[PDB]
Write an enzyme that holds these catalytic residues in place. Structure first.
Site, PDB file in Angstrom:
ATOM      1  N   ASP A   1       0.301  -7.787   1.595  1.00 15.71           N
ATOM      2  CA  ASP A   1       0.684  -6.377   1.622  1.00 15.71           C
ATOM      3  C   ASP A   1       2.177  -6.239   1.810  1.00 15.71           C
ATOM      4  OD1 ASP A   1       0.587  -3.609   1.720  1.00 15.71           O
ATOM      5  OD2 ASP A   1      -0.297  -3.505   3.753  1.00 15.71           O
TER       6      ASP A   1
ATOM      7  N   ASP B   1       0.537   1.273  20.241  1.00 15.16           N
ATOM      8  CA  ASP B   1       0.326   0.706  18.912  1.00 15.16           C
ATOM      9  C   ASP B   1       1.116   1.476  17.877  1.00 15.16           C
ATOM     10  OD1 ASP B   1      -1.088  -0.847  16.907  1.00 15.16           O
ATOM     11  OD2 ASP B   1      -3.014   0.175  17.194  1.00 15.16           O
ATOM     12  N   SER B   2       1.219   0.921  16.666  1.00  9.71           N
ATOM     13  CA  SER B   2       1.709   1.659  15.514  1.00  9.71           C
ATOM     14  C   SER B   2       0.531   2.552  15.020  1.00  9.71           C
ATOM     15  CB  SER B   2       2.164   0.702  14.427  1.00  9.71           C
ATOM     16  OG  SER B   2       1.165  -0.255  14.144  1.00  9.71           O
TER      17      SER B   2
ATOM     18  N   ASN C   1      16.072  12.444  12.849  1.00  7.72           N
ATOM     19  CA  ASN C   1      15.116  13.525  12.663  1.00  7.72           C
ATOM     20  C   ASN C   1      14.920  13.661  11.148  1.00  7.72           C
ATOM     21  OD1 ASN C   1      13.885  16.080  12.236  1.00  7.72           O
ATOM     22  ND2 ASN C   1      14.419  16.574  14.373  1.00  7.72           N
TER      23      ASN C   1
ATOM     24  N   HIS D   1       0.823  -1.206   0.000  1.00  6.87           N
ATOM     25  CA  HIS D   1       0.000   0.000   0.000  1.00  6.87           C
ATOM     26  C   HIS D   1       0.858   1.257   0.000  1.00  6.87           C
ATOM     27  CE1 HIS D   1       0.248  -0.239   4.463  1.00  6.87           C
ATOM     28  NE2 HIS D   1       0.461   1.070   4.271  1.00  6.87           N
TER      29      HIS D   1
ATOM     30  N   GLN E   1      -0.860   5.822  11.799  1.00  5.29           N
ATOM     31  CA  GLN E   1      -0.712   6.519  10.507  1.00  5.29           C
ATOM     32  C   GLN E   1       0.700   7.064  10.287  1.00  5.29           C
ATOM     33  OE1 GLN E   1      -4.421   8.496   8.764  1.00  5.29           O
ATOM     34  NE2 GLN E   1      -3.846   9.791  10.488  1.00  5.29           N
TER      35      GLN E   1
ATOM     36  N   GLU F   1      18.375   7.829   8.925  1.00  8.31           N
ATOM     37  CA  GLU F   1      17.631   8.941   9.476  1.00  8.31           C
ATOM     38  C   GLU F   1      17.332   8.816  10.941  1.00  8.31           C
ATOM     39  OE1 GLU F   1      16.874  11.706   8.374  1.00  8.31           O
ATOM     40  OE2 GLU F   1      16.198  11.693   6.276  1.00  8.31           O
TER      41      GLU F   1
HETATM   42  N1  6W4 Z   1      -2.901   0.927  14.546  1.00 11.34           N
HETATM   43  C1  6W4 Z   1      -2.526   0.085  13.411  1.00 11.34           C
HETATM   44  C2  6W4 Z   1      -2.124   0.937  12.203  1.00 11.34           C
HETATM   45  C3  6W4 Z   1      -0.773   1.020  11.825  1.00 11.34           C
HETATM   46  C4  6W4 Z   1      -0.417   1.808  10.711  1.00 11.34           C
HETATM   47  C5  6W4 Z   1      -1.406   2.445   9.958  1.00 11.34           C
HETATM   48  C6  6W4 Z   1      -1.027   3.250   8.736  1.00 11.34           C
HETATM   49  O1  6W4 Z   1       0.007   3.918   8.819  1.00 11.34           O
HETATM   50  N2  6W4 Z   1      -1.749   3.190   7.587  1.00 11.34           N
HETATM   51  C7  6W4 Z   1      -2.868   2.321   7.265  1.00 11.34           C
HETATM   52  C8  6W4 Z   1      -2.494   1.972   5.807  1.00 11.34           C
HETATM   53  N3  6W4 Z   1      -3.576   1.404   5.038  1.00 11.34           N
HETATM   54  C9  6W4 Z   1      -3.707   1.332   3.722  1.00 11.34           C
HETATM   55  C10 6W4 Z   1      -4.891   0.762   3.458  1.00 11.34           C
HETATM   56  C11 6W4 Z   1      -5.567   0.425   2.149  1.00 11.34           C
HETATM   57  C12 6W4 Z   1      -5.798   1.599   1.170  1.00 11.34           C
HETATM   58  C13 6W4 Z   1      -4.801   0.476   0.810  1.00 11.34           C
HETATM   59  N4  6W4 Z   1      -5.527   0.453   4.692  1.00 11.34           N
HETATM   60  N5  6W4 Z   1      -4.656   0.864   5.618  1.00 11.34           N
HETATM   61  C14 6W4 Z   1      -2.106   3.367   5.290  1.00 11.34           C
HETATM   62  C15 6W4 Z   1      -1.262   3.931   6.456  1.00 11.34           C
HETATM   63  C16 6W4 Z   1      -1.487   5.416   6.541  1.00 11.34           C
HETATM   64  O2  6W4 Z   1      -2.597   5.899   6.757  1.00 11.34           O
HETATM   65  N6  6W4 Z   1      -0.374   6.131   6.307  1.00 11.34           N
HETATM   66  C17 6W4 Z   1      -0.399   7.578   6.109  1.00 11.34           C
HETATM   67  C18 6W4 Z   1       0.334   7.719   4.737  1.00 11.34           C
HETATM   68  C19 6W4 Z   1      -0.246   6.822   3.621  1.00 11.34           C
HETATM   69  C20 6W4 Z   1       0.651   6.010   2.912  1.00 11.34           C
HETATM   70  C21 6W4 Z   1       0.210   5.126   1.932  1.00 11.34           C
HETATM   71  C22 6W4 Z   1      -1.153   5.025   1.666  1.00 11.34           C
HETATM   72  C23 6W4 Z   1      -2.084   5.765   2.412  1.00 11.34           C
HETATM   73  C24 6W4 Z   1      -1.619   6.683   3.366  1.00 11.34           C
HETATM   74  C25 6W4 Z   1       0.491   9.178   4.277  1.00 11.34           C
HETATM   75  C26 6W4 Z   1      -0.264   9.697   3.215  1.00 11.34           C
HETATM   76  C27 6W4 Z   1      -0.068  11.022   2.798  1.00 11.34           C
HETATM   77  C28 6W4 Z   1       0.882  11.823   3.444  1.00 11.34           C
HETATM   78  C29 6W4 Z   1       1.644  11.315   4.500  1.00 11.34           C
HETATM   79  C30 6W4 Z   1       1.462   9.977   4.891  1.00 11.34           C
HETATM   80  C31 6W4 Z   1      -2.762   2.350  10.341  1.00 11.34           C
HETATM   81  C32 6W4 Z   1      -3.120   1.605  11.477  1.00 11.34           C
HETATM   82 CA    CA Z   2      17.715  13.607   9.066  1.00  9.90          CA
END
Ligand code: 6W4
Ligand code: CA
Length: 223
Positions: free
Chosen positions: A84, A171-172, A54, A40, A174, A52
């Site tokens: 994934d 937890d982990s 900071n 994803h 976004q 990295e």
């Molecule tokens: N608590 C468990 C948990 C752990 C990790 C996540 C998580 O990180 N997640 C959850 C991830 N995810 C992707 C999907 C399906 C659509 C395919 N469902 N869940 C997506 C990521 C996030 O939200 N990251 C933020 C990031 C992004 C990167 C790739 C795709 C979508 C979003 C972003 C986007 C724009 C700018 C900066 C960053 C979610 C939940």
């Molecule tokens: Ca740096």
């Protein structure tokens, strides 16, 4: 990472940041030229940032290398998040040292109860939004397949595991996705998904890396 701690600069030497003008995903360096991340996290124009701490300041140990090729798992399903995983080949080999180092692939799958280290630059709040600049870490156990399935009925495949705390609070979150889950010096998981962050009975779900070692090894050996 919610409820974690500041890792310390370069103490997670295999952790990389995927940057497309901004940090958007984590990844894991598995050899000098390849990174494992979540499917994803696929996008065009990725720069891999190694060494990295900071992510907003050039501190002196970074290596910035463009991706030359991305390979999403052939069976990745973006609706279910099954399979994934993706591989990223670097345009040039990273210079390996104590602060930029690869993580070993698992031989064996890690059991419920195994303690792991999860790391990333994701959101540190469960309600609200705060993005850290430095790398955050969380020690968390792998949960039983039965507790994982009971938490997410009908959604956990054989290529996924839960880790964390059913009571919530740690937890982990976004921004951490694509990053490593390391247990006893092996990459056992990739941060994949979950229902919110750090909520009760909603632990994080991770890609089960041990199921992909043959595909990873064959893909690198050829590309
Ligand atoms: N608590 C468990 C948990 C752990 C990790 C996540 C998580 O990180 N997640 C959850 C991830 N995810 C992707 C999907 C399906 C659509 C395919 N469902 N869940 C997506 C990521 C996030 O939200 N990251 C933020 C990031 C992004 C990167 C790739 C795709 C979508 C979003 C972003 C986007 C724009 C700018 C900066 C960053 C979610 C939940
Ligand atoms: Ca740096």
């Amino acid at each position: 990472i919610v409820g974690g701690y500041t890792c310390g600069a370069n103490t997670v030497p295999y952790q990389v940041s995927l940057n497309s003008g901004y940090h958007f995903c984590g990844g894991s360096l598995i050899n000098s030229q390849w990174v494992v991340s979540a499917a994803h996290c696929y996008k065009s124009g990725i720069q891999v940032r190694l060494g990295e701490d900071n992510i907003n300041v050039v501190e002196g140990n970074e290596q910035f290398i463009s991706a030359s090729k991305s390979i999403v798992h052939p069976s990745y399903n973006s609706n279910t998040l099954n399979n994934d995983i993706m591989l990223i080949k670097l345009k040039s080999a990273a210079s390996l040292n104590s602060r930029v180092a690869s993580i070993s692939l698992p031989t064996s799958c890690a059991s419920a109860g195994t303690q792991c280290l999860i790391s990333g630059w994701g959101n540190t709040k469960s309600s609200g939004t705060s993005y850290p600049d430095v790398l955050k870490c969380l020690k968390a156990p792998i949960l039983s397949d039965s507790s994982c399935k009971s938490a997410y009925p009908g959604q956990i495949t054989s290529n996924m595991f839960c880790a964390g705390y059913l009571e919530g609070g740690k937890d982990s979150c976004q921004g951490d996705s694509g990053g490593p889950v390391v247990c006893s010096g092996k990459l056992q998981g990739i941060v994949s998904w979950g229902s919110g962050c750090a909520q009760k009975n909603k632990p994080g779900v991770y890609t089960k890396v041990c199921n992909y070692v043959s595909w990873i090894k064959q893909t690198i050996a050829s590309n």
